[PDB]
Design an enzyme around this catalytic site. Structure first.
Site: not given
Ligand SMILES: [Cl-]
Ligand code: NA
Length: 128
Positions: A50, A52, A48, A46, A59, A35
């Site tokens: 959002s 992380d 969309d 991301n 998220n 990650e």
């Protein structure tokens, strides 16, 4: 902070992650490897809208508030920036909530695709 492999293992263990929801320490270290490459300051946007955040790329869509993810929740009740501290306490507390949400570590797509079913114990090999 860029953690060492055994340094992070020890930090997760001290914050009660080892065997949490039945996931061995190697699963958590492996997830953090893929990650964040063990970097507490890692952030990635991301598609969309959002973001992380942190060692475990939590998220903003569900778990932390960054003030710019429309329609998101803050189920860990923390600013997303607190997930970027060198102290991993907030990230661990929120990960415990994520992994308890029903689907285990599958919440971490990188864990599912790169750690799940592998020899995760290798990630804690040689660690004291
Ligand atoms: Cl599970
Ligand atoms: Na949010």
């Amino acid at each position: 902070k860029v953690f060492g492999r055994c340094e992070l293992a020890a930090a997760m263990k001290r914050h009660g992650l080892d065997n949490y929801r039945g996931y061995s320490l190697g699963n958590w270290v492996c997830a953090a490897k893929f990650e964040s490459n063990f970097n507490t300051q890692a952030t990635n946007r991301n598609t969309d809208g959002s973001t992380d955040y942190g060692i475990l790329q939590i998220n903003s869509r569900w778990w932390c508030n960054d003030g710019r993810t429309p329609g998101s929740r803050n189920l860990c009740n923390i600013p997303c920036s607190a997930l970027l501290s060198s102290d991993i306490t907030a990230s661990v507390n929120c990960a415990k909530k994520i992994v308890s949400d029903g689907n285990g570590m599958n919440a971490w797509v990188a864990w599912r695709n790169r750690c799940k079913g592998t020899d995760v114990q290798a990630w804690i090999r040689g660690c004291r």
